[PDB]
Amino acid sequence: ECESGPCCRNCKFLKEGTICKRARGDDMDDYCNGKTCDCPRNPHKGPAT
């Protein structure tokens, strides 16, 4: 969350799909879920950013 905007995992953005943390199993990356870019893509166990 370089600032708080999504699509910038760590201020650079990956490519829409950077799941926060694959809770369901582990964790992937961090994609812009349309809210932020700090692992906003971990709709697993109970993640989601």
Quickly count: other Cβ atoms within 10 Å of residue 5's Cβ.
Answer: 15
Number of Cα atoms under 13 Å in the Cβ half of residue 20:
21
Q: Which domains does the chain have, with CATH numbers?
A: 1-49 (4.10.70.10)
Pairwise CA distance, residues 31 & 29, whole Å: 7
Answer positive or negative: Cα dihedral of 3, 39, 18, 10. positive
Sequence letter at residue 17: G
